[PDB]
RNA sequence: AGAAUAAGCACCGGCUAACUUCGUGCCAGCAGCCGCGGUAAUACGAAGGGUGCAAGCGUUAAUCGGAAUUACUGGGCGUAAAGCGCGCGUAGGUGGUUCAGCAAGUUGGAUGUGAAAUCCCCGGGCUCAACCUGGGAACUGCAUCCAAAACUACUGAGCUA
RNA sequence: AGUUGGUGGGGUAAAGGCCUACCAAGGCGACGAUCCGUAACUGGUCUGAGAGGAUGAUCAGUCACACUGGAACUGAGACAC
């Protein structure tokens, strides 16, 4: 399945930016993002430790747009792997094909990059892939099919990704829309607000 | 070569055969203590030269009767 | 289910109006559906004002 | 040190002619996250006053704990009353695998890899006593070397 | 105990008895309804609970609770019973499944209407 | 009825360091002497002396360092009712190796580190930290 | 007799074969005496199409083991290379 | 070719993430445990809103866990359950202290075996995954040889606590 | 009470109370015989930090059965799906 619906109540409930719109205009001047959704919005309601852990996990899942069973699989694989599962989970989440296409500026958001990947418009090693879970390895060359290189979507996505910050782990060849995955981005390459310790704490119970 | 078993003689009332007791010491599977177990074997004494209390050694051969497949080769500690 | 409930309602109303009836309960098996329906239809006009026959 | 964790808040009562008087008790732990930790209890007729008293009591009588870089030296087993406590060092990727009062105590003290467990009564205050009793009698090397030289003992 | 005493007599494990002796390891069992009536709850509660006596295919005869706000169960109706005791009524260890064989499910229910056998209003 | 005298040695040392004494006296044996020797080699005691005349007595001098006894915890592992035997890889590490565990090997009575170095298992006797 | 044949594994429409030395009156995927290599009808990429133990195959052929038709053809092909 | 053909289920008093109005009034009903309902019910029934999952969601049945609640690892017996009313003694368990020997226990090594699959590690093929598959590790065990002699066992001779 | 052992003989593809005739009075058992109830066994599977606990669907090895109770024939091989 997939979460299809209002993609801004999630930001208000989580209480952070949690990028889900294109970021073109703003976030504050679309939803008054200071109240939880629903009738009881003005209430604050300090919550418990289990609530904090649940909110952290939900925030990560809604950032990357994956459901619970696939996320449990990701956690099990991160625990199986060596070296501190806490950032192993982020390493593994940051290597999905839709996320990589988003980071390369081909799509405005994760939903639009999923739209592109699922609709057979992306080739990884010169051959078509349409699974928005394909773990891209270091050194792959994500490109755009020639019959799909004239879509405007890519044009606006690129010109708007031009100003959001330098990822500095993928090299995009802007003129013909070809990328490159140098390596997985380390923990210091991501925002230092996610407390993955809460996620590991939640699942270890 | 040939492997043997060593033990005491506990009965010789039968004819041309003897009853030998073999003591083994086995560690208990769960509680770890060492307990002693006993095995009773019927061995073949061709010339009836073993008496109760003797410490002897035996080996394995083909069955010679039912419930009798061991033959003795040497008396090493004669009883009083 | 709906027919059973409606029949129960009507029968309960009529019985509470009158009083009680003595039932003769039978379990009927047959070889063909036509024979079964004929038997069920024909074993309904055999009762009385105080006794009745039911196919359970 | 300034890290406040509200371990527990409870309502107690006493009986006099007329009825009941209610009081509020609070148990908290304070520390800097780099070696020092203390605990405090505070009672009042108001929850904020009890919590402030507990914080002020815990800010006193702090103790210094020897730890091996956000990790314990060796497994420890400590008891207080009917409460028993087991602790043992864990690797870097682990979090705090502990329950309730132990988690607050260990997080405040500054250890991050503890893989702990408790047996017996799970009264939070007695668990806190048992956890400080275990953590305070923690020797670490260069102190166990009172006998002889160093690097030969290990 | 000592190691010698434990070797001579190992520690013994006590088995826990099932709460539902009828329906022996089955999720549900069907039966025929022998009596339909109402009973009075225990002391702190007051109500008129709906219970039915059911004879199962095992040969057992038990008492089953009928949930919901209205039912249509008579004598000689075939029902499906499942586990779960009613704490308030003494001696009732089973529940009747609404909407399974002859129970028809609760009418006009619109919230949580899968524990009561009610279809989607659409 | 003195079923086990080595546990009596350990208990005498323990009870004497609880009572803040300096010297401990007991009947001696060739195993108690080895245990005392390895304890001294590890620095847990000051000295040990053995008398003459057919009833020799072992006298152990205790250390204190600060206002607490040097021997914090001592306990006998293999009592005459269990007889625990261990291999090389199963030798216990008391307090992460900060303490020592005495092992009787076919090469004599020594410490766990010495047994690991020599690649020899044996009979675990007692543990000290 | 004792034969050398192909035991089928893998999955639906994706067959893999083990070259097995079996008593002839056993199940195709039942008990065997020894496995002396494998055969891959699809292979591709880094997968090898077939591999055999020369030593074991010659030893078993010297002891009077009758290979099947496919085993004969594949074994002679492997000996060719 | 066209957005066209495709979202439901449980829950919202605490445990345990998520709350208010309207009906009813110890009724009707709910309930895993505490417990709710007697005229302002966040617990019954609806409606708005929200929280979990999602082609599934709940309930029932069953096993282990949490339960250190049969405690070998790892519990207890003055008053919470728990020292036989008290001796003597059989099997059994256990054994003060020195030499010397043996080698059953004990320790180390070598050899053989411990089917394949399964679990685990590194790889390879299906667009990915499930799945299939190569090599390795493991199978904690058993048997036979060689070696050692601190401890226990056994044998011989002593000593007096 | 062929029960336990010895001897002569028979029988089997083959050792053997497997059978038979004499001789002796042995054999097993609180380290649980006999009896009662229950149950194909294993690799393995599910849980568990481990130790353990529960359990033998699919896959593979072994065993037993072929409406019920017996018996043999043919055959290298059956007491014969
Ligand atoms: Mg799915
Ligand atoms: Mg004979
Ligand atoms: Mg308790
Ligand atoms: Mg239940
Ligand atoms: Mg809440
Ligand atoms: Mg109201
Ligand atoms: Mg409630
Ligand atoms: Mg409600
Ligand atoms: Mg259950
Ligand atoms: Mg347990
Ligand atoms: Mg339970
Ligand atoms: Mg114990
Ligand atoms: Mg207890
Ligand atoms: Mg009492
Ligand atoms: Mg009393
Ligand atoms: Mg008494
Ligand atoms: Mg005695
Ligand atoms: Mg002695
Ligand atoms: Mg003795
Ligand atoms: Mg294997
Ligand atoms: Mg691949
Ligand atoms: Mg190997
Ligand atoms: Mg020697
Ligand atoms: Mg006869
Ligand atoms: Mg003869
Ligand atoms: Mg024959
Ligand atoms: Mg026989
Ligand atoms: Mg004869
Ligand atoms: Mg018995
Ligand atoms: Mg059976
Ligand atoms: Mg456990
Ligand atoms: Mg079994
Ligand atoms: Mg089957
Ligand atoms: Mg099979
Ligand atoms: Mg027959
Ligand atoms: Mg013939
Ligand atoms: Mg047959
Ligand atoms: Mg046939």
Structure report:
In chain A, helix 4 crosses helix 5 (85-93) and helix 5 (85-93) packs across helix 9. Chain A has helices spanning 9-14, 28-31, 49-64, 68-80, 85-93, 97-103, 110-118, 152-161, 196-203, and strands spanning 122-123, 143-144. Chain A is mainly α and 205 residues long. Chain D has 154 residues and is of the alpha+beta class. Helices cover 23% and strands 33% of the residues of chain D. Chain D has three helices and seven strands; from the N terminus they run βββαβββαβα. Chain D starts with a strand and ends in an 18-residue tail after the last helix. Chain G has helices at residues 54-62, 69-80, and strands at 2-11, 14-23, 34-39, 50-52, 66-67. The radius of gyration of chain G is 12 Å and the shape is globular. The B-E interface holds B 28, 30-33, 35 and E 3-4, 6-7, 10. The structure holds magnesium ion (38 copies). Chain E binds two RNA strands through helix 1. The PDB classes it as ribosome. Keywords: Initiation Factor 2, 70S ribosome, cryo-EM, translation initiation, initiator tRNA, conformational changes, ribosome. Pseudomonas aeruginosa 70S ribosome initiation complex bound to IF2-GDPCP (structure II-A).
Summarize this structure briefly:
This is part of a larger assembly, with seven protein chains of seven kinds. With 154 residues, chain D is of the alpha+beta class. Chain D has helices spanning 47-59, 101-109, 124-136; strands at residues 4-16, 19-31, 36-44, 63-64, 76-80, 83-87, 117-120.
Q: Note the gap between the termini of chain E.
A: 67 Å
| Number of DSSP helical runs of chain A | 9
Each distinct ligand:
magnesium ion
- Largest sheet composition of chain E: 5 strands, mixed, barrel
For the biggest β-sheet of chain E, the strand order reads: 1-2-3-5-4
What pair of chains forms the biggest interface? D-F, 12 and 11 residues
The major pleated sheet of chain A works out as: 2 strands, antiparallel
The SS-based structural class of chain A is: mainly alpha
DSSP helical segment count of chain E = 1
Order of helices and strands of chain E: HEEEEE
Outline of chain A, from the CA principal axes? globular
Taking the alpha carbons of the first and last residues of chain A, their distance comes to 27 Å
Q: Rg of chain E from C-alpha positions?
A: 20 Å
- In terms of DSSP E residues, the strand content of chain E is 25-35%
What integer value in Å does the Rg of chain A equal? 18 Å
- Beta-strand percentage range of chain A: under 5%
Order of helices and strands of chain A: HHHHHHHEEHH
GO molecular function (chain F): rRNA binding; structural constituent of ribosome
Subunit structure (chain F): Part of the 30S ribosomal subunit. Contacts proteins S5 and S12.
Family (chain F): Belongs to the universal ribosomal protein uS8 family.
Keywords (chain F): Ribonucleoprotein, Ribosomal protein, RNA-binding, rRNA-binding
